[PDB]
């Protein structure tokens with residue numbers, strides 16, 4: 020002790036930036052009467068230190084003056100969560116009785132010495148969250164008594180040593196955040212007691228070893244975010260204890276092995292972001308424990324098997340971004356726990372099944388860019404748990420007020436590019452959590468129900484390219500949280516409400532291709548975030564108000580195809596960020612204000628088909644203007 | 657994806673009292689359905705309209721991961737810290753609006769790689785240093801403003817800056 | 832504490 024205690028005390032002297040409130044204030048008397056009872060972090064057997072525990076003590080220093088020659092009986096060493104810097108000495112391999120070695124969460128650098136391989140009594144090795152570099156020494160394979168190795172979040176390079184096949188007692192192998200290289204050693208498939216194998220987020224190349232079919236005890240296999248190639252070995256189906264299988268973000272090829280259906284314990288399966296091809300094996304319907312099934316972003320083809328109706332515990336089904344085709348089998352939506360159904364970016368056909376929301380738990384449903392047709396099933400109308408619903412780009416049909424019910428939890432919905440008809444039901448107001456209502460390019464008619472403006476939480480509203488009638492009320496001001504407002508391409512009439520003044524958060528306004536009939540509100544001068552305003556193809560009938568020139572942030576402003584008259588106010592020179600102007604097809608008169616030469620951001624102008632006269636101020640926009648941009652004026656010099 | 661993870665990184669470095677960044681759902685494939693972000697036809701981010709958002713915090717180097725980001729509007733906020741030189745990785749770039757903030761430190765010399773830059777406004781800040789010579793080689797810059805900043809050094813008219821007027825350099829303590 | 836890595840979910844639309 021007295022030699023051990025004095026040797027430890029000499030090492031404590033190396034510590035830097037240590038305050039008097041440190042836990043190591045207890046290291047005072049080198050006599051055994053206090054060394055083995057009152058020194059923080061030390062424990063003795065027969066009066067000799069066997070245990071050194073200094074986790075999370077705030078020590079800053081090095082192991083250079085660690086008393087290797089003075090502590091022969093160390094069997095438990097934890098120095099994690101400190102500020103130790105330097106390298107791992109080969110002397111660490113001298114502690115013949117050591118069983119637990121932890122130097123995680125530190126600032127160590129350099130290679131791992133081969134001498135660590137001669138710690139024949141070691142049970143657990145932790146070197147986590149350091150900056151160690153080099154290749155793992157082959158001598159680590161001498162640790163026949165080890166059960167857990169964790170060296171993840173480091174700068175390790177080179178291959179995994181094939182000598183690891185000698186570590187028969189290993190149950191846990193954690194090496195994920197690293198830069199290991201080469202093929203997986205096939206001896207790793209022969210570890211009998213292995214339970215968890217995490218090799219994800221590395222630079223591994225080559226095929227998955229077919230010997231992995233021997234790992235009858237492994238429940239977790241993380242190898243995602245690698246450069247694995249070839250095909251998934253069918254022998255993986257012999258891994259009858261496997262719970263989670265994640266090979267996502269790799270360069271695997273070929274079809275899914277039909278032998279995945281043998282693993283009755285498999286609950287999670289991530290195969291996404293790869294290059295697998297072929298058709299979905301019908302045997303995948305026999306993965307009875309399956310909960311999370313993800314095959315997104317691949318090159319799969321063919322129909323989904325009806326056997327998916329046997330997956331009674333399925334909650335997430337990710338099949339998006341593939342080349343699957345045909346109709347959806349009703350078995351897909353059989354699960355009462357089904358919560359997420361992502362199917363966009365595919366080549367499907369036909370109708371949605373009536374099982375779509377059988378359990379009443381479906382949250383997210385995505386069908387973008389497919390060839391679905393027919394009406395909305397009744398189970399989806401009455402499904403109240405919807406959060407995200409994406410129907411964009413299909414041939415769906417039916418009455419829009421008869422298709423959809425009430426959704427208290429609805430957050431986002433996009434029904435654009437479809438064939439819905441009818442008039443909007445006021446039921447949408449009850450979806451008080453909705454923030455995005457996007458319904459463009461449909462056959463919808465009628466007037467906008469007034470209750471829509473009472474949806475205060477709405478931030479984006481897109482009813483463009485429809486046949487909606489009526490006029491916008493002054494209650495338009497109720498939705499001031501809006502930032503994108505797209506009502507263009509409709510049959511909206513009457514005057515533009517001055518309540519648009521109070522929608523301050525507005526970034527993007529599109530009211531063009533409509534039938535607005537009276538003069539522009541002079542009070543639209545307080546939109547400090549608007550960069551876009553399009554009022555083209557309407558019936559506005561007076562002079563451009565001076566309030567428009569006060570919106571500093573406009574980038575584009577299109578007032579074309581109107582009955583606007585009067586003179587072009589020179590105060591448009593104030594719009595310092597304006598890049599585009601279009602005033603064509605109007606009855607504007609007078610001369611173009613010569614102050615416009617100072618609009619350096621202006622790049623595109625059109626003034627054609629008007630009643631103006633005089634020479635053009637000289638700027639970049641006017642010089643590059645084509646002859647169309649001045650057509651049909653009176654006396655433009 | 658990669659662009660969404662980068663904008664998620666910004667979302668974690670800014671204190672958002674006004675709940676502007678709420679729509680920035682990180683588990684989406686692309687951030688193109690988020691608010692205040694607009695994409696082109698290829699689902700690559702081209703605009704970030706975060707002006708006057710009452711955001712507080714520090715910028716994040718991951719802002720250089722938007723190759724197609726043409727307009728970056730972070731003006732009129734209480735953001736602090738420095739300008740990370742990784743913004744020079746914005747190969748396609750038109751507008752840089754960081755004015756009206758609490759930013760400090762130098763003007764990274766890496767901004768000379770944004771040869772497409774038209775508008776650069778950094779006024780009303782705590783920036784300190786000298787104007788890099790690299791900014792003189794862009795030849796696309798049209799509108800420039802470094803007012804209300806405690807910089808130093810003489811006004812660098814190396815050719816491109818020949819067209820600019822003292823309002824661009826007013827209250828700068830340059831000379 | 833030493834933990835095992837968790838697989839992250841696929842991106843949704």
Ligand SMILES: *[C@@H]1O[C@H](CO[C@@H]2O[C@@H](C)[C@@H](O)[C@@H](O)[C@@H]2O)[C@@H](O[C@@H]2O[C@H](CO)[C@@H](O)[C@H](O)[C@H]2NC(C)=O)[C@H](O[C@@H]2O[C@@H](C)[C@@H](O)[C@@H](O)[C@@H]2O)[C@H]1NC(C)=O
Nearest residue numbers: 105106107126127128129130150151152153154174175176
């Ligand atoms: C493994 O990393 C060692 C540390 O290098 C630095 O570590 C951090 C402080 C950080 O700054 C990191 O970016 C650096 O790379 C290398 O040793 C250092 O090498 C440098 C010069 O390369 C030298 O000035 C240092 O004195 C030296 N320190 C120590 C403790 O050795 C390792 O050595 C390298 O390996 C050689 C094969 C060769 O690549 C050479 O560049 C280095 O000597 C690194 N080992 C590797 C990369 O295998």
Ligand SMILES: *[C@@H]1O[C@H](CO[C@@H]2O[C@@H](C)[C@@H](O)[C@@H](O)[C@@H]2O)[C@@H](O[C@@H]2O[C@H](CO)[C@@H](O)[C@H](O)[C@H]2NC(C)=O)[C@H](O)[C@H]1NC(C)=O
Nearest residue numbers: 445448449451467468469470471472473474475492494497
């Ligand atoms: C839009 O809403 C306003 C008021 O908002 C709600 O009013 C209550 C019905 C209740 O749901 C509150 O939580 C909301 O604040 C409606 O106008 C009010 O209607 C009530 C009748 O219940 C009446 O007593 C008030 O005087 C009305 N005015 C105000 C200023 O409160 C309005 O009718 C709604 N519009 C539509 C089309 O439904």
Ligand SMILES: *[C@@H]1O[C@H](CO)[C@@H](O[C@@H]2O[C@H](CO)[C@@H](O)[C@H](O)[C@H]2NC(C)=O)[C@H](O)[C@H]1NC(C)=O
Nearest residue numbers: 063064065066067068069089090091092093116
């Ligand atoms: C602490 O270490 C000392 C030094 O190695 C041990 O003393 C040795 O004990 C072994 C048997 O365990 C003997 O073969 C040696 O001859 C002893 N050498 C000396 C110099 O005493 C001591 O046993 C260790 N204590 C514990 C509890 O392991």
Ligand SMILES: *[C@@H]1O[C@H](CO)[C@@H](O[C@@H]2O[C@H](CO)[C@@H](O)[C@H](O)[C@H]2NC(C)=O)[C@H](O)[C@H]1NC(C)=O
Nearest residue numbers: 060062070071072073074075076095097119832
């Ligand atoms: C080493 O020290 C740490 C803390 O100094 C001990 O960690 C505690 O362990 C017990 C049992 O696992 C837990 O109830 C506590 O919550 C832990 N505290 C932590 C993790 O901060 C650890 O047990 C010590 N080990 C030995 C062998 O003494």
Ligand SMILES: *[C@@H]1O[C@H](CO)[C@@H](O[C@@H]2O[C@H](CO)[C@@H](O)[C@H](O)[C@H]2NC(C)=O)[C@H](O)[C@H]1NC(C)=O
Nearest residue numbers: 325326327328329331348349350351352353354
């Ligand atoms: C979808 O629905 C059920 C799954 O719950 C299957 O039909 C029967 O469900 C009962 C539930 O108690 C089972 O006992 C029966 O064995 C099921 N039928 C058969 C033939 O096994 C149905 O098969 C599922 N799949 C579809 C309709 O494709």
Ligand SMILES: *[C@@H]1O[C@H](CO)[C@@H](O[C@@H]2O[C@H](CO)[C@@H](O)[C@H](O)[C@H]2NC(C)=O)[C@H](O)[C@H]1NC(C)=O
Nearest residue numbers: 507508531532553554555556575576577599601
């Ligand atoms: C404002 O919206 C109108 C549509 O309402 C846009 O007009 C388009 O202009 C191009 C240019 O020739 C035509 O090819 C399109 O056919 C027009 N669309 C329609 C529906 O007629 C106009 O471009 C928009 N303005 C701005 C500045 O974006």
Ligand SMILES: OC[C@H]1O[C@H](O[C@@H]2[C@H](O)[C@H](O)O[C@H](CO)[C@H]2O)[C@@H](O)[C@@H](O)[C@@H]1O
Nearest residue numbers: 418420421441442443444445464465466
């Ligand atoms: O006064 C509303 C009354 O009728 C609702 O049905 C509407 C109504 O007939 C309207 O005139 O035509 C619409 C179709 O264009 C119908 O949907 C009906 O739901 C009833 O409950 C309501 O009280």
Ligand SMILES: *[C@@H]1O[C@H](CO)[C@@H](O)[C@H](O)[C@H]1NC(C)=O
Nearest residue numbers: 210211212213233234235236
């Ligand atoms: C699985 O692990 C247990 C641990 O008790 C072991 O007894 C069994 O032999 C292992 N299965 C094998 C090696 O097939």
Ligand SMILES: *[C@@H]1O[C@H](CO)[C@@H](O)[C@H](O)[C@H]1NC(C)=O
Nearest residue numbers: 232252253254255256257278
């Ligand atoms: C492992 O699966 C293969 C199928 O590829 C099979 O031929 C083999 O018999 C299985 N292993 C055992 C021990 O049965």
Ligand SMILES: *[C@@H]1O[C@H](CO)[C@@H](O)[C@H](O)[C@H]1NC(C)=O
Nearest residue numbers: 435436437438460461462484
């Ligand atoms: C919807 O958009 C497509 C392409 O954008 C185009 O055919 C038209 O504008 C609309 N078609 C239908 C069928 O709604």
Ligand SMILES: OC[C@H]1O[C@@H](O)[C@@H](O)[C@@H](O)[C@@H]1O
Nearest residue numbers: 667668678679680681682683
């Ligand atoms: O509700 C809070 C949680 O919401 C989720 O959408 C994510 O943003 C999480 O990072 C966050 O912790």
